[PDB]
Amino acid sequence: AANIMRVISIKNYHSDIKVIVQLLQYHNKAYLLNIPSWDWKRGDDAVCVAELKLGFIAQSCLAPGFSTLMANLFTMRSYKPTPEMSQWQTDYMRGTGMEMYTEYLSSAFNALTFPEAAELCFSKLKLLLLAIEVRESTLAINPGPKVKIENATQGFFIAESAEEVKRAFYYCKNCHANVSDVRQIKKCKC
Amino acid sequence: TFDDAGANVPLITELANDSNVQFLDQDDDDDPDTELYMTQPFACGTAFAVSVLDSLMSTSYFNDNALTLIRTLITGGATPELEQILAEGAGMRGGYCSPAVLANRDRCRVAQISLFDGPLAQFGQGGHYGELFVYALRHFGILCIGLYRFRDTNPSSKRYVITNPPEDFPLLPTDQVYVLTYK
Amino acid sequence: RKFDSTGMFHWCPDRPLNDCLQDRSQASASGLRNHVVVCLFADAASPLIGLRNLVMPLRASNFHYHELKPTIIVGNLDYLHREWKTLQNFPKLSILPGSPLNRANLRAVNINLCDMCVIVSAKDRNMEDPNLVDKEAILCSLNIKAMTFDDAGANVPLITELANDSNVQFLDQDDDDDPDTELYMTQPFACGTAFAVSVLDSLMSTSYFNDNALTLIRTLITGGATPELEQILAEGAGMRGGYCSPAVLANRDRCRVAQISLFDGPLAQFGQGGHYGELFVYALRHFGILCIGLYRFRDTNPSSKRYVITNPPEDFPLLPTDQVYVLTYK
């Protein structure tokens, strides 16, 4: 109730401000949707402690260890390998260096089916492609072969850095599909 | 001990303060200087700590739609209209719902697949992660995220999470693969 | 019909709370409307507030029985058992137990077609941050205002206690905030959606400078809480009553506040571009009815939000949309 009050104060003072609020319980989220200038499509957001805290534990019952895969993949970690680390600790850390990013796909992906786009991202670009924005907006994770990737859709990637992901925006099926070393895919040929 | 083993029981624990992780497990490269994300009980997934959630605020600011991808994966799809149906205070309404509704009973979900047996076993037998990745997606439409592997490679029932291996990374028939599936 | 000794109020023999406690099934099954809904926030331990001071003027003996506005209290059942001893004498009253916030409750009492809704907190409060003293009242108000009724939540009329004056700015959105503006100029106050207990300390000042004025407040407000009624309550027996004598019932013709619309009926020509003094002299003359002020829309063309003009000048122009505050015997 106290944290809601604030969002009411802040939204009243200047309507279009971006607000992110930490709620404790699930059902309190209902009250935010009543505030006149609250809009999550516009981009305001509420993170709920009881929703995520138990939700991670729940997925860990369906797939052991998954809680850590999630907790690292959505938080900054420092990949700083050193020779006195164990073999397992080094492989683990490189894995903790992974981050999520999003980018618009190149016109080279137009009208592929999602499995083709994923195969190209993984094999050709060295990027893991999870999900896409699709029109009317909705988010889809591992879509079935019945879908086509439409032009100028935004994709969701797991990679080392945002710079590493930019290849998915540049790649060309005519101009660069022949290239071996991926560290040159950004070019004027398209 | 259970007669006819208590260390073999899998469990997950809330930690309310991060430094307490050191107590959960004894045998360790103890190193109290190590921050949580490197400690053995965290890297195994036996621990979890609510401290992670404040880092999500930071990420959701820098990268807005990413938090929606958390909630789709985590909750099995707590939609806005489900939140509205709960907001009407009546509790969850239900019945033998229509085929037009039940068409949503084919979302994607997290699963683990073992390389010990079934149609992937040859990749477990000294293959490379990219061979498995391309094969599995191709034949099953199933998307592979990482490995859950034993520490005492030979075992102790304690493994560790490798997020997203490189293409050439070698597999063992003991490994388990995190995957996104329709099965 | 039965009345309380003094004849000033309608009356019934007592009854246990369970005689007019209701479930959502029952409350929604009785097709009630034109009612008053009271949204009451309390814990079982919170101080009494005497809902008698609200129900009592809503049951004055001037009204005929059929035009008594039915009343539902929505709130904590344990708190409602402490108050009930004071209420049990009144007709056409009932309770729906539970939170006022769950919209199941609000829909089961037909909030979409009450004649008023009242938001009140009996909880302890000022023993907190002075900005946060009335979380419940604000959150309730937005939660009502946001509903939709199919076959409109912004059209629901309601009154709210504010425990701190500066919180008035939250009750309403559309508004030139000007957080510098003092309460008596703010839009939710000028519309009559807000009310603030801070007003009462100013009454002390006035009652010193102008002694008999406070009696004119109590005659207008309470429907006539007389000294001998106060004595009958002071004897601790509760309100005594029966089929009282014609010599008592002669007091069922006091004056009361009413609103009259200029949209239709015998005044309509004044609504059609007349001047306030023409209406004033005409109405008093033919009906003995005395006109005090206007309640007028802001978006003259509408939004269901009006404002109060106390005592217009003689020549002030009327619109057929206006409503007139009046003192009457009808």
Side-chain angles (χ1 to χ4, degrees), chain C residues 270-292:
Chain C
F270 302 116
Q272 295 176 4
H275 305 276
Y276 185 69
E278 305 177 313
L279 162 65
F280 181 93
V281 175
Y282 182 95
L284 172 55
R285 188 80 54 78
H286 303 286
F287 310 116
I289 215 184
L290 179 67
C291 311
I292 311 306

Side-chain angles (χ1 to χ4, degrees), chain C residues 85-150 152-274:
Chain C
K85 306 300 294 187
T86 73
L87 303 179
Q88 65 190 322
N89 304 307
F90 296 120
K92 304 208 301 176
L93 171 66
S94 62
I95 295 102
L96 174 69
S99 178
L101 292 171
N102 71 316
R103 288 181 193 178
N105 289 343
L106 300 170
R107 290 194 153 83
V109 306
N110 307 329
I111 303 301
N112 64 303
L113 54 65
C114 72
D115 278 6
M116 188 52 70
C117 171
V118 166
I119 295 174
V120 165
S121 182
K123 292 190 174 186
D124 175 15
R125 287 186 291 185
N126 197 52
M127 306 188 176
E128 299 186 14
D129 179 321
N131 304 274
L132 307 183
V133 293
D134 54 15
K135 288 173 289 284
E136 281 78 0
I138 296 152
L139 288 173
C140 189
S141 180
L142 280 310
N143 181 49
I144 309 312
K145 194 174 300 294
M147 293 181 75
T148 56
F149 292 100
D150 190 23
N155 299 351
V156 174
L158 68 86
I159 321 298
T160 303
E161 280 193 11
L162 300 180
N164 185 9
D165 302 347
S166 60
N167 289 8
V168 69
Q169 69 196 2
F170 304 136
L171 283 79
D172 139 84
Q173 271 51 48
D174 151 64
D175 157 63
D176 17 62
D177 199 341
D178 337 326
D180 51 297
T181 52
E182 75 274 29
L183 183 54
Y184 81 85
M185 298 297 306
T186 67
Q187 188 204 147
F189 188 99
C191 294
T193 289
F195 177 66
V197 310
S198 175
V199 169
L200 278 55
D201 298 338
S202 312
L203 301 182
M204 298 198 79
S205 171
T206 62
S207 66
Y208 169 71
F209 289 115
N210 189 2
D211 55 4
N212 60 16
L214 189 143
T215 297
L216 185 46
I217 296 174
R218 306 203 313 95
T219 45
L220 279 165
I221 290 300
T222 63
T226 67
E228 77 293 341
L229 176 62
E230 214 294 302
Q231 293 158 17
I232 287 290
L233 290 164
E235 292 298 325
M239 296 178 72
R240 301 179 189 161
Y243 296 101
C244 295
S245 69
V248 164
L249 297 174
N251 73 24
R252 303 208 312 97
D253 187 3
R254 310 188 288 278
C255 73
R256 64 184 184 87
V257 180
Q259 284 189 332
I260 300 297
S261 180
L262 299 186
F263 188 82
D264 58 12
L267 304 181
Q269 65 289 338
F270 302 116
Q272 295 176 4

Side-chain angles (χ1 to χ4, degrees), chain C residues 13-27:
Chain C
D14 295 22
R15 59 182 184 276
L17 199 168
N18 299 88
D19 199 29
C20 62
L21 186 64
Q22 298 188 151
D23 303 346
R24 282 193 288 278
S25 55
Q26 294 169 321

